[PDB]
Amino acid sequence: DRPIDDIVKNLLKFVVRGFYGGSFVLVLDAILFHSVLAEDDLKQLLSINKTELGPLIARLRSDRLISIHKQREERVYYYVKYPHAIDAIKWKVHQVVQRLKDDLDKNSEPNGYMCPICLTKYTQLEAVQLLNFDRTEFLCSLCDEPLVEDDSGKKNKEKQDKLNRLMDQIQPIIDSLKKIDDSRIEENTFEIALARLIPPQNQSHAAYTYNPKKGSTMFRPGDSAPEERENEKTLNDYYAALAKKQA
Amino acid sequence: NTQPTIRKDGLKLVGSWKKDRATGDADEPELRVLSTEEILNIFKHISVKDFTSLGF
Amino acid sequence: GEKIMQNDRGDVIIDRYLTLDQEFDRKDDDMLLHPVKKIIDLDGNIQDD
Amino acid sequence: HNGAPHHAIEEAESLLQFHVATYMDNDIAGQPQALQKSGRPVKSIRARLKGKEGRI
Amino acid sequence: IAAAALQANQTDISKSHDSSKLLWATEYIQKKGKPVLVNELLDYLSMKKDDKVIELLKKLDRIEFDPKKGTFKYLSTYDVHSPSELLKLLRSQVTFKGISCKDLKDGWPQCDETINQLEEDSKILVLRTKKDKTPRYVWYNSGGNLKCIDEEFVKMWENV
Amino acid sequence: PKKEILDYLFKLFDEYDYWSLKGLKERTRQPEAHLKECLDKVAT
């Protein structure tokens, strides 16, 4: 379909390949290669168990990546909610960016002190109020220990470089985010993934169909969108002339 | 939307949406135990003047 | 010439071909695209300024 | 966090809510009693603050 | 005297079952690394005529007759003995079913080393055990490197 | 006794196609690991 959806899928592939386990890589690649899937079909394809499946599925629910669908035919299906997924990704990358930027801003500040007897850190101001009468060094309030300076000033450039190279690594995600913001997103549903059903098996137990309910108003989160060769020819005509004669 | 009729029971809360909007009478009450999470969210979605009306 | 409606259930067997017909429509529109004469090109007209 | 088969979750959270309810009060409608060792039931804060020499 | 004992214990080719005879014949085919002619069969099972056993052996997919000469050859599960063919097969895959190393060793015994170096090349999606890196079902590396972001950045990501 | 029990197995599943392991074991009285590796090589 749209190449931006393909960019989204490849973005998911890159994100999991760069930030998550190989099992997560396999699971998300398989369920993007295919569509909504039953659990036993996954067990058949990957030859896996519920014990292995549990933490991975739980983590994917935690990052709000794949919406889990359940229906009675109960058969459990799984699909990537695109807007919630990209909003979670945007929130996480925004949080990472703000976290590391404030880390660099804080690491640009003076490092501070600590008293290693009580293993408690001390700020520069806390050192100022804890000085000696000599106006030279700083003594602890409880342990009465001469304050020793924190070691982060050399770490300032290290955290800056880690920030820089992490932005370099994350830059394709930024570009895909830019193209996504250029695009306009349609929200995934289970039946939308049914319309793009990609069957792995010809022996799957699950009926990958949606069966709606009348008389029901059940509302839940995660689902909200507010010559010789001439002779035989004449002989063939000879047969046809004789055949039409009897008729 | 339609509301249930909540039955207090044990240490939890169940709903029953009769809702009367099938092709027929809709005699299907959704006997669903309301999550503390969704009660918290919907309580987060109340107005300030609604608090004052309710006495909060 | 009928607007689709989710109230209609259709036929599931025939309606499995819905996305196939959709990508047929996309391919056919791709074939139908062609350059336009500037004497009548409203796209050039709206790309005046 | 690990494999959640969705049939221990309900009773696990029910036990959690039950126990925090018990710690808050043990003078509730008589479906539980929730005693510790030994047979004397655990006194909760309502039992600590009730009439006749409970803190007031 | 051991040879005499083995000759005395040698069961005649008139076995209780033609299936048993054909099973021993498939053992004889598999233990030979070359397409063996029909005379090798006449050597092994001591009979000359074309049989229902021989006809079913011809009908066997794993046992291929040679119309040119008669060299019956064993047919493996996979006709892939190069990593180029392996990658072509992986790219030619139609579902995400993985492939065991055993039937790949069938035909290509030097496939496990190839799998290991392809994983070190990060060109595959291998499944390896937790006791040790014992390769199992494999898949094509549709994306980039598996070892993509450094351990400290992945670590602080897990802190995220 | 590989070959003898192999043919003996062929009569045995000919007697009954759903021949169980316990029914197999009483019909053999043999080393069981030797018994189990023979069974899966041909059938179930």
Side-chain angles (χ1 to χ4, degrees), chain A residues 13-14 17-20 26 29-30 33-34 44-47 59 92 96 99-100 162 165-166 169 199-200, chain E residues 94-98 125 127 137 139 141-146 148-150 152-154 156-158 160:
Chain A
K13 290 180 203 309
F14 173 51
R17 275 172 171 84
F19 293 104
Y20 296 93
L26 268 68
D29 286 348
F33 182 76
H34 295 304
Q44 178 267 344
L45 288 173
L46 295 183
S47 291
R59 192 151 166 87
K92 286 180 71 67
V96 163
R99 169 207 326 272
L100 263 192
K162 283 154 63 49
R165 297 174 295 110
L166 199 52
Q169 288 149 341
Chain E
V94 288
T95 59
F96 211 65
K97 185 52 172 299
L125 311 181
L127 173 60
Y137 291 167
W139 300 268
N141 187 18
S142 172
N145 48 358
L146 322 170
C148 194
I149 312 298
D150 310 335
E152 296 178 352
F153 309 131
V154 174
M156 61 79 71
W157 175 256
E158 294 304 316
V160 171

Side-chain angles (χ1 to χ4, degrees), chain F residues 9-10 13 17 36 38-44:
Chain F
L9 193 140
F10 273 113
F13 268 98
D17 56 314
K36 292 321 147 174
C38 283
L39 175 62
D40 51 356
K41 263 166 81 68
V42 286
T44 66

Side-chain angles (χ1 to χ4, degrees), chain F residues 29-41:
Chain F
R29 304 141 310 290
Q30 263 169 36
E32 305 91 295
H34 177 272
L35 176 57
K36 292 321 147 174
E37 62 87 19
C38 283
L39 175 62
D40 51 356
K41 263 166 81 68

Side-chain angles (χ1 to χ4, degrees), chain A residues 1 194-198, chain C residues 7 12 16 19 23 26:
Chain A
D1 285 347
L194 284 193
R196 214 177 285 160
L197 182 60
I198 306 164
Chain C
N7 178 67
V12 185
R16 193 43 204 175
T19 67
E23 63 92 19
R26 301 184 302 112

Side-chain angles (χ1 to χ4, degrees), chain E residues 11 15-17 19-21 23-24, chain F residues 2-3 6-8 10-11 14 41-42:
Chain E
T11 302
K15 299 291 180 68
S16 298
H17 291 269
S19 298
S20 60
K21 305 170 56 183
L23 184 55
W24 261 111
Chain F
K2 313 159 69 167
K3 306 142 177 272
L6 187 145
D7 295 333
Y8 190 87
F10 273 113
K11 274 81 72 178
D14 203 8
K41 263 166 81 68
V42 286

